[PDB]
Amino acid sequence: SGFEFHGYARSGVIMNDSGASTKSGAYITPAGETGGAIGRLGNQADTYVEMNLEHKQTLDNGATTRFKVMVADGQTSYNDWTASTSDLNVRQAFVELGNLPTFAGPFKGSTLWAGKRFDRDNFDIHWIDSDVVFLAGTGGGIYDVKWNDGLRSNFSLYGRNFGDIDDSSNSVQNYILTMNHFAGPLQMMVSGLRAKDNDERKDSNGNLAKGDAANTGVHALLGLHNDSFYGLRDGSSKTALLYGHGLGAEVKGIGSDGALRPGADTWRIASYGTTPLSENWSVAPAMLAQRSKDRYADGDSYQWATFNLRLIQAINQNFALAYEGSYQYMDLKPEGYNDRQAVNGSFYKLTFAPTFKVGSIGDFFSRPEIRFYTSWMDWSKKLNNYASDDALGSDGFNSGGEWSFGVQMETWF
Amino acid sequence: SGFEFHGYARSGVIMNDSGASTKSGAYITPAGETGGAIGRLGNQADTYVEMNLEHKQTLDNGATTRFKVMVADGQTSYNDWTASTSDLNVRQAFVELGNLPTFAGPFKGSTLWAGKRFDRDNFDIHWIDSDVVFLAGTGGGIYDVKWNDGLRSNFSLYGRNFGDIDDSSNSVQNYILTMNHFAGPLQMMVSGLRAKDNDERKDSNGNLAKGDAANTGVHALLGLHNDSFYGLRDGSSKTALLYGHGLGAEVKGIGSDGALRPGADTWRIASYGTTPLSENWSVAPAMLAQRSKDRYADGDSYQWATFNLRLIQAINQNFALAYEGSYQYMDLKPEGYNDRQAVNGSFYKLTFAPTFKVGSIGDFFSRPEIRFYTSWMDWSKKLNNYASDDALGSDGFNSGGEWSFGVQMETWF
Amino acid sequence: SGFEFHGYARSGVIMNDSGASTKSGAYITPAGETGGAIGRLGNQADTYVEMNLEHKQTLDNGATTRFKVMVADGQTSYNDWTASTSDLNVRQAFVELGNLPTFAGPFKGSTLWAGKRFDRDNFDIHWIDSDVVFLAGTGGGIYDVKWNDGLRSNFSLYGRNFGDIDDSSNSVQNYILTMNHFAGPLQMMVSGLRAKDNDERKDSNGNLAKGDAANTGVHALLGLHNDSFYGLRDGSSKTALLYGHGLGAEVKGIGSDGALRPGADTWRIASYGTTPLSENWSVAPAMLAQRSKDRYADGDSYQWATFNLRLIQAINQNFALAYEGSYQYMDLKPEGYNDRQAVNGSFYKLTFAPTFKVGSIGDFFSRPEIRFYTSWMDWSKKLNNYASDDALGSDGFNSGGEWSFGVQMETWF
Numbered sequence A, B, C: 001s002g003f004e005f006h007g008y009a010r011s012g013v014i015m016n017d018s019g020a021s022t023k024s025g026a027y028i029t030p031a032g033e034t035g036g037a038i039g040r041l042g043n044q045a046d047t048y049v050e051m052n053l054e055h056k057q058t059l060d061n062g063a064t065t066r067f068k069v070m071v072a073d074g075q076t077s078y079n080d081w082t083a084s085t086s087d088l089n090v091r092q093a094f095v096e097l098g099n100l101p102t103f104a105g106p107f108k109g110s111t112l113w114a115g116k117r118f119d120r121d122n123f124d125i126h127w128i129d130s131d132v133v134f135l136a137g138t139g140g141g142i143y144d145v146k147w148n149d150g151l152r153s154n155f156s157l158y159g160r161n162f163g164d165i166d167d168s169s170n171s172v173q174n175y176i177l178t179m180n181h182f183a184g185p186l187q188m189m190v191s192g193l194r195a196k197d198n199d200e201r202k203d204s205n206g207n208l209a210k211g212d213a214a215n216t217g218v219h220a221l222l223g224l225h226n227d228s229f230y231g232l233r234d235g236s237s238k239t240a241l242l243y244g245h246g247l248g249a250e251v252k253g254i255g256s257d258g259a260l261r262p263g264a265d266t267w268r269i270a271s272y273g274t275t276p277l278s279e280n281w282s283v284a285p286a287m288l289a290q291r292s293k294d295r296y297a298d299g300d301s302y303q304w305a306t307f308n309l310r311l312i313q314a315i316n317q318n319f320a321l322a323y324e325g326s327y328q329y330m331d332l333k334p335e336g337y338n339d340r341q342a343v344n345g346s347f348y349k350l351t352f353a354p355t356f357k358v359g360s361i362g363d364f365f366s367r368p369e370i371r372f373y374t375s376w377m378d379w380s381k382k383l384n385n386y387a388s389d390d391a392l393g394s395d396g397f398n399s400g401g402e403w404s405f406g407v408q409m410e411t412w413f
Ligand SMILES: OC[C@H]1O[C@@](CO)(O[C@H]2O[C@H](CO)[C@@H](O)[C@H](O)[C@H]2O)[C@@H](O)[C@@H]1O
Pocket: A007, A008, A124, A125, A126, A127, A365, A412, A413
């Protein structure tokens, strides 16, 4: 065949009760810095776009060829001309050679790839704008090596960079070796990471950028992909247990954190489900919790847990009422790192969003959708103290209740 | 259906009688700073490109779905690699849900939209590179609410930003509420603008960026869309009378000027027509005049009137001779704002441009076209004094007559 | 017709025997600064992408219409988000009017164009990532003016810029006039270049950027396009003899070098061939040699010669073994320019690269291909002294043997 255009786009407005700007984002809480994402409905004011241009090809012998480029940009500005603050950048550029006649045995229907890409098998928890696992970078590998006709595996090498790619003395390559095995509903992912002399990166001045930074890492994922809402109702669900040590201590963006100590230790649990309550109501609960010790400073600790609950109610074939509630508890002990002060407390979010679409309302993933919304946000005052250049506690976002309103669209195809 | 690729692109060269650079642009005159556009033929040396990638969709029930992104860049450099000066940026990203089976009554054939976009109903005077009205930003709204079967209306909320989107104390959101009514050839547009605490934006130093800047504004447009050359000959024409106060004092780019005073008052007239003189000649006159008082400085005044005249002459089915004459009078009293000195005088432009195309020559909008040209420009010497970093009066562009030559292409599809 | 998406994309990884970064690139040798490219197989660690979006159109009368934009970006970073270092930029934007019913005689099937583009008739030596001739910029022209039914010619005007396009006193336009004639396998190209007052460009401080820089230039290309491997075996081959003086002294990127002296004199020879040794082996030898005197400093001299040899061996219908050997000699006498020290010596490169593809292996240009590789590089220690911020001699790339490994994809469609 030929060309295909795919992509994602969110774009909207959010204002407080006075018709002016406020803070918003799935990562605005102090916990957000270590991955503590909260509900995103009516809580995203940026114009984010991803453009996927593809060149597919099928040969008569069954062999496939595929090329894809991803160009992305994310703007907080509402203006029609954002050249000065543009973030337009090529995120992906890779080729896939699939179903080769020459590959036999366990390599029968396997697909070889190379270039810069997001791993095909990454997966996320949509309502919280957080990936469960996100393996990206530049490299190569093979998908779907079928063993015994009931155990498939992926093997790959992904390369990333740490520090300033322009400053040779403050730049390091981080490599990741990963084997991903799938056996029915079960998934076992194991990665080995390594960035030689990461601890010896000198900044522009001549001093050590870190000194106690890790040079290696280990990462693992244990996942369960169900075809029912946790086995008790129609729907679907996914549960994943993540573990990381050293450079592997950042369990979502694998190999994306160059500041982790050798002893940085992380455990994380991601879980969510989709289930129809009635021919008009659908519910999707999700939880993300993490425990990270000795991450950036000796003796530090970052603990938080997010609970998100999205509910849609079909009224028409085109109109639905969506609701979202987020709850997050956090206890962060930064030990002076980044001028952060130890903090603990909770964050809450309530959103009511009338939604229009043409697709199946009971489907959380049917996308052309336009929504109007209102949110209420509150939190323990102590969280204001985590940072001084933070969102919580800045000018006009420190009181108890904060109200926001807006309109936005979101799609993918 | 699926994917659609649409766009615009102009690109070419302009040199003076010595084979070296000169000044060019529809906005080069002192009047240009307040909107005083002049003829653009042979007067645009940049490579400007707009790329529109769309994903349209039609459901069996008549409902439509549409997503569009616009990526643009504008370069003055003639080089094949402009990475260092690139202005590539996402101008638009929106979705439209049209003709929903669930929308009845006045909402019958209406289309709902959200995201970042240029209003569907903006319209321009092409030969002068000036929109009559340009509503753009991020928001949402609805098009074509049919009342009594002879009165359609559009309602919407558009959001924009003033100042540095990165500097929190020098950054403000400006919101625009607008109702646009159409009744046959008549159009009545009304907008309310509001940017809370615009007057309190402190620059990076700590001082007020303005102090006497407006926080609100009002804007109106009275348009007449004819199906004849001003009712006296075959063709078409449009006339619009624009008025603005406060933040609405910038009558073209609505909500785009954050330095306007509360008492800034502006009146503007836009008018043009298209008419075939014979089966081989076509003429298009256009006029843009403006009166703006107390705009940026107390007691200031900007007045100017542009007269453009584009003539084409079919010689073949592929060759045409195009001519353009521009005349502009201006009287500007800046009262010391920006180091500008009060000035008054006139500007002239004559352009002869052999043109090649495949489309209908009598049509001013059939686009694939390549043109060669020569231009002569002259103006009142006094205009050289408006500014010191101006175009008129810079090194090599201060004498009486100024000749230019070049080639350029222009399209849209 | 409508839309066409075409492009090029290379993307991969290169690491040394310690799993860390190394130097790589077809232009890393001291000779590279004056065009001395070496083998590129397994010697390109960047993610370079070119996206070509086109809008073609054919009218019933045979007349064609074509619009093309090329958007490119090149990153050395392996990361999935390169907004901070993005080089995304519009490289081309042009229109072509082909086969006009009105064009008769020698203009019969000729094609008119204008805008920013790379000349349709540029051609390169692929394995060494070097164009033989590269005419690009902004202008207009005509392709295929048929004389006597055995002599075709292209005539064109190309515009380029020297210096900082933003700094008016350090900015100059360089214009190129070129006539390119083809008579069977023979090609004769002649260009006149001129940048008025190039020698008078004052940098930001107020001093002359150069002072002894050239204002004009001359360029000539003599080429032979064969339908056999140098007339002794099946295949193909091309040989070109290039000459340049003054501004024409940079014989590849015509009009792209603003620092050349008036007496800069350059001779270059490019030649390569393609030939199948057997139904499984294919060989492609290539040579690039250059002699450049009085280039940037009076009495300077840059001489070098690159010999590249690519060999592929089909093992399957999808698996091939590719080998590449590069040899380069250089004798450079910079005469103090840029802090370079006169140097002489040779560079060697051996690369073994198992390659996967679906297309014709014996075809060096069939593209979807994924390769794994290992390279060995060594050079005369003296070359380390050419510059201090060079690649040869930097930290960890100064010893004798340097090994590298990696995987990468490369395509075009
Ligand atoms: O359809 C798969 C494809 O969609 C993207 C957006 O282009 O992700 C969106 O859709 C997913 C469902 O398949 C959601 O889980 C996700 O949150 C949403 O952004 C791609 O990332 C994915 O490849």
